Amino acid sequence: MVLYFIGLGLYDERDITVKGLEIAKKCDYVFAEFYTSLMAGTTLGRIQKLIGKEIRVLSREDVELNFENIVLPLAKENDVAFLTPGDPLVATTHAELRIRAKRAGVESYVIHAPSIYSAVGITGLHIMKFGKSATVAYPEGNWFPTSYYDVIKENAERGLHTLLFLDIKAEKRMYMTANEAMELLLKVEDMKKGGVFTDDTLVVVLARAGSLNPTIRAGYVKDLIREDFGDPPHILIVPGKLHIVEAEYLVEIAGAPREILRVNV
Amino acid sequence: MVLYFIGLGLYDERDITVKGLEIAKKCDYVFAEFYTSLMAGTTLGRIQKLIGKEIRVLSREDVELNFENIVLPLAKENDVAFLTPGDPLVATTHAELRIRAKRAGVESYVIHAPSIYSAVGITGLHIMKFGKSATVAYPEGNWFPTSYYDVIKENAERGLHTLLFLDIKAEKRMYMTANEAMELLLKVEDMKKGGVFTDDTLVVVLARAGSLNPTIRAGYVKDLIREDFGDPPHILIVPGKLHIVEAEYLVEIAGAPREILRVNV
């Protein structure tokens, strides 16, 4: 009669909250999806072992299309767990699954977990200063999305930071790198020529948040465009005007050039 | 010889990540602070028990003026852990404490936890649609902070949601409620009169995120300002231009007036 949306964390199988782990163990069935995002620091098996129960993976279609046929039915007569990377209702369309639960007379509860949306706070950039967020999608066929470009422009204009989620082909297990995102923007800049993203623009790259050894680097596009930030997942941030304090943190902890202390403050 | 920054979560002691717990367990000394936020579902005793360590709680001044005197020193001889509500680097200036740890010669690591910043997802509002954030500060005497008003304004202008962190005075055990926040905003409406916040404005309130039954309400200032939302902590949200899908979740789960469904395109 109960369905729990349990967050799985950022990186590995230990980023789940204690609350989420116990509740999962008590559930009769445990489903999980791994398309919205991917747990780079662990494996389906490791996760299974930790929780103890056996996890049934759902595809994008299984969820978006037949969640009410695969999951909800059991949730009627039992206690079901739905596991998703990061935080349950973040950056995903899962929030509407709660509406379906209600429609089927099923109670749903949310168990949160760290999100990349809030873990960027490790970059020293002030959470309160983040403006509208966006996704840098891969150009395909005749489709070449460039909206993120504008999102970055409206935020910088008002002195806010822009968080750019990078593209992901969960299926193909293919991650978009910070470099590839920096490349695309340069092309969008070259087409729109608004002076929003250029070799002189300051950027921050957060790689593998959640890990004890994440990669936090700040620098000018021309200098980071070809730097190796390690294995995915990646996150690109185009900061607005920096606080002296924000800036010091990027220099002292993300190896930012001293130049930002005078040019970007 | 290191320093760990561990998040405790949103509501009770089980909101810490397994990663965080297992690390806190194997630490020599465990500091903390409960002034940046309020965990409405636990006690220092329950945390200590779960951690199996004695937690010395520091004050803002202890931290802001003596961290390198009370904490870092031990960090050179032992593994120290500094716990905090929710995520330690969200809506706090703790990130600066890392610069200290460094100049003191002390490696530091960050372990995240669910944060109110990403927990707003449960409201049904898209995470990427949130623009700049702000805090509604308690007036102190003849001083009346108004900043947050312009933040709301600036965001609604761009059709983005606004996350309003409510003030806290842990020392006095004062926890601004969503009602108090609304009341203050109305007064600021008279001051600046910009048609930013009025009896007819739609607002969303999230109370006690992290609990299995948080209070999620959406409605018009006039109908909510007098409504009881339960014990703090509270968070107030001023949505921008809704999506039909956001409107549905608000109506179906937040209990918003069905009229909001008919969006004005």
Ligand SMILES: Nc1ncnc2c1ncn2[C@@H]1O[C@H](CSCC[C@H](N)C(=O)O)[C@@H](O)[C@H]1O
């Ligand atoms: N640990 C991590 N480090 C850096 N980026 C990450 C990451 N985890 C996820 N991401 C970013 O977030 C995107 C997933 S979109 C969904 C976000 C997820 N629900 C959450 O709450 O975290 C990935 O494509 C990548 O751009």
Ligand SMILES: Nc1ncnc2c1ncn2[C@@H]1O[C@H](CSCC[C@H](N)C(=O)O)[C@@H](O)[C@H]1O
């Ligand atoms: N569990 C919770 N439920 C509702 N609001 C919360 C909350 N936790 C924090 N808040 C809001 O955020 C304010 C504290 S600011 C600190 C936030 C914390 N660092 C985090 O990561 O979440 C509170 O006064 C309240 O306005």
